Amino acid sequence: FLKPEQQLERCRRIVRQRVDPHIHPSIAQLTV
Amino acid sequence: FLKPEQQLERCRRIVRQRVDPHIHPSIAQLTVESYDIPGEPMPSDEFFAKLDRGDIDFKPFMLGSEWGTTWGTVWFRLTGTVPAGYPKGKPLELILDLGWYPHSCGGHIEGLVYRADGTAIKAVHPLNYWVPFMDAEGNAQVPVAEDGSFTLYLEAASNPLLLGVPPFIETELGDHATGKPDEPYVFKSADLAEFDERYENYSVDLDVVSSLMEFADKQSPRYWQLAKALQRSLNAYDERNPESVEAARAVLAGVLAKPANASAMNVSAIGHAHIDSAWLWPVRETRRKVARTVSNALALMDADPDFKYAMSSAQQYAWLEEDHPDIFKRMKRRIEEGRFIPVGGMWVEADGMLPAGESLIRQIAYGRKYFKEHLGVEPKGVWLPASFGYTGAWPQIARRAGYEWFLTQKISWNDTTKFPHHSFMWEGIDGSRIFTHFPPADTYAAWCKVQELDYAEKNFQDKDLSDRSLLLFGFGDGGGGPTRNMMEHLHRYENLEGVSKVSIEEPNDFFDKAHQQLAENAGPEMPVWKGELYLELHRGTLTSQQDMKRGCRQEESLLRTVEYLGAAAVLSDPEYVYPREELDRIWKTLLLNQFHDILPGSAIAWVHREAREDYRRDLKRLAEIAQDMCAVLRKANPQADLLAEARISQFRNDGASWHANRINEPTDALSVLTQTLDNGRVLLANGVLSVTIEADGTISSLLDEEHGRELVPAGTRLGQYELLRDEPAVWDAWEIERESLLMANAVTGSIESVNTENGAAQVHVHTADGDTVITTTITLRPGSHTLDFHADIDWHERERFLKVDLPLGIVADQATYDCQYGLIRRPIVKNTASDEAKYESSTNRFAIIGDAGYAAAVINGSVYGSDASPIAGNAAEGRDSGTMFRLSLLSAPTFPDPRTDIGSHEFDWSVVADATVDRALDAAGVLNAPVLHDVPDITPLASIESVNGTVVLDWMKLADDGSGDLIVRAYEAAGGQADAMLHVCPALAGASVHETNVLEGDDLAADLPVALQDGRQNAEGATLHFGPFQLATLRITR
Amino acid sequence: TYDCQYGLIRRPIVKNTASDEAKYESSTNRFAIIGDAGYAAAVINGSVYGSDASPIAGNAAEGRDSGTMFRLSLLSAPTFPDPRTDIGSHEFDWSVVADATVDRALDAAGVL
Amino acid sequence: NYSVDLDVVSSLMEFADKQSPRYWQLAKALQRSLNAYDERNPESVEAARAVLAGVLAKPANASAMNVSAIGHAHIDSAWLWPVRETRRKVARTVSNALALMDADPDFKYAMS
């Protein structure tokens, strides 16, 4: 009834899309 | 002392560095000029017309530059020259590169090559980018001058890659053509090169040996012999001496000539290339993809004998015939030889669940007609490699259409359950059986690799009764097709130890041989699967893009009404002319819109916008045509009384099926009463029902009179809206996950107004969530057992799923749903993991849930997906028991369309308290019938009344000939034996009736029952004996 | 539909999966009912418990239409625990009810 | 012969590389042979032997090794018995070998 592989795939997708971008959110642009 | 892994690594390095570069060594450089079209694609005929009239610049282009826009086209003029007397016995091919991504194929840029005359030669693909230029003795595909100068054209299409290595990423590059360089690619290579077959053969042999070693069952003599042969071949090959590549090839000959095992299965391979009519690209690119695929197949046939290719969709055939007459003529000559096999005999590869039975019949009829009148080929089987499940009425329709076998491979995508058989007999709900085969390779586009063959051998589920499997090889789902490498690999696998015997064979011969072998071996113990082919995946396709389903159902109902009205008018007014051409065009447009990617709703925004425009235009045109036919009928029938607002719905109860009935007919029952309670609760009471509405606009008490039954369990609210978080890991638009359930959030509303327009009570409820507003009208009509709900929704959510709860208070183990031509039963209580996988099924206009002594029905307007669960309560609180039945309304995917179903939507449904099969069919027919105006109350052309059993006359139409005969299609809906007698209009006096097939071909199989005994009879008084879901078809001649 | 101790049970006649095939020999309690939507027939037994049911798919080219083969287990002759098992005289009673409902099946089972 | 065929088929199934066509074909052949054999009818043992003939006539694999077999019987001059019993053991072994040669052609025996 519980499929661990689906949980692993969902975890990888969630980390890639919804968790990692929220780390280091840009607040200002720099001039080079 | 010998390490096979080191040998494998050395072989891979040698192939990468010293063998592959020697294949196609460049001998000349080409000069390139470009002409860009940022907008719509430019037809080839008029392009070449102005080209030979001028009007084109062809600005010079340098190698390594960026050329393409997001959806534009580039025409490249390639000018080159050959060296002096260079073609010394070698083909001297031509190589073009457009910036192919190595880990991608069939989802990005492509191109086609044209001569100066205007005839295509061969398309270019990431894995197949060689174009034949000259022959060994000097024969060239293009004119060449004495100086050797030559010119060619290349039409390159630049399409965005919507499926990258990060799968399912939201994008905005699927709406239209922007004319901007969103992601340009480099060209960097256009060379004229020579062809050396020895190096290619050596590469193929090395690859085959390595792949055989990968699955050679280590610690066996074969593995070590292969390793030793590989080592010796690598040692004997010298790059400095070109001739040594011959001697190395002589080393691998010993191990490659070993005969196959005695028990190895026999595999028949047929060239295939799946092309979706509309998926991640519009139809305009679909036509070009079809042309490129056919050109590639023709080039492969020319360059290689003993190669066969199969093509399925008739619409693509028509598009190719209309666009490229020369390619069509070449394909026709190939067909006459028997090397190009048309399969399927259908307009498109439509979905197997959503379309109605008449839609599938029209698929088959139009496909067969096109195949007979334009190709002279009559397919013997159904070709549907990809489909999100099948209704289970397919075997009867296919068997009555003359088909003999079925093909399918999508069932392999199940989440938890493995289908018990690969080759078997699929039996419908009626009893008709057809021979079905599932390719064990689990794919329709094989790359011709040893690992695919080994997986197919180990995956077969009928090894004890058969040893025949079908392999479909080539590049699919984006065009392309089989390549030369695939043919060479197959030729190597023809007779090899450790690899099954693979031969090129027509699918008909394979199916005949497999069926005969199964009959011989199995006998009494022969596999049979009865029911539907449910797919445990893509369960969200029943709700995504609700406009598609709504338009499909509305168009089908309107087409039924229009054809009935036309048949009635023709038999009354001889001067009337039936609009056959316009109706045929509308039917073909709908059939194309019924594809397995448009109807589910998993394409880009452009495809769905075009489909919505087509639906709206066709609906308006059909309404106008129906109005014209109604006016003609009114003119021809002055004695009848006009009906200002009336509907015609098949199988209306009380023996008034095909009669036009008013919306508001007077009733003996008094007007329904309304009452306001203390806490804002609203009480509605007609003579048969009592409805109580709470302050939040949800039904809490639905009492049925004269039965003492409460239809709402205590502690549950009816009509409550639920919001779910839909964030699937894969296939966002396709999938709704189990984790989405069990976390629905209740959304509360309030009562706004109560009104009584024509004696029917109406209650208005507003529900708000934030930029999303639902306005619900709850209607109770006097003298009726049905409670009606109408909903207007302003969907503005994101990644959310909307559902409505309809508790029933009936303990039932199974629920009955409507099928295309019958009924199906699905479990409500899920005991095993297999049963749990069916947590989201489909409904066809109604569902019935009931115990032994009582039943209630839920009727829906244009909703397909739904689910049912038990409700086990406790007497310590008040909750007794029941069944929670929920309907899926809206969803908001993001991957294919960033804004999906954002806007206004309308829904209609109803609850029938005391319901049987007849009452459910009546309610479903009445609700789905289109509304028309000013119709005479004319006698129906034909009528079918059943003394015992339930017989529904599904369709009446005119024969698709000049004869003008009347075709009547009926079926048994209850599920048991039924007896009926046929009646006809007084105008049809002395007419004769006889039985035909679904295609009106007058030829039917002897195995199937007829249900019309004594053969030809008179139209009036004919007797019919319907079995369970008989689906009889009759033809009446005046 | 078969009789239970204090109710009724439903068992599949058409066996699609391997799990369904494992139930090729079930138990009956004084009667069994087999019927479609509009008709039903009952088999009443005196003291027989084991039985089985299978489909009958015929062809119109010969005359066999369709049906359900319902068989009752009467006697067996094992040898390991008892060398002579059920060797001798036995009596059995059963009946077929043409137009049968739950009430009629219960009536016939009680009377017999 | 039937016993030898059944033993060979069973031992082949024991190492038949399950999930391969050979394993399932051997299983089906064994089941059919067991079903076709009736102990009450002595002649049926012939017909059962005809069922296993199909799977026992399959040719060997191309890469299979070639094995040469020679009759052997190791006899220790003195180990757990005196020499007087060693002489009798030698005589018995030679007598058995001679009887096997008489009762079967194409048999060879080696002595050291």
Ligand SMILES: OC[C@H]1O[C@H](O)[C@@H](O)[C@@H](O)[C@@H]1O
């Ligand atoms: O399975 C999803 C997807 O698979 C393949 O790429 C094609 O058949 C598509 O038509 C389909 O939508």
Ligand SMILES: [Zn+2]
């Ligand atoms: Zn597809």
Ligand SMILES: [Zn+2]
């Ligand atoms: Zn020793």
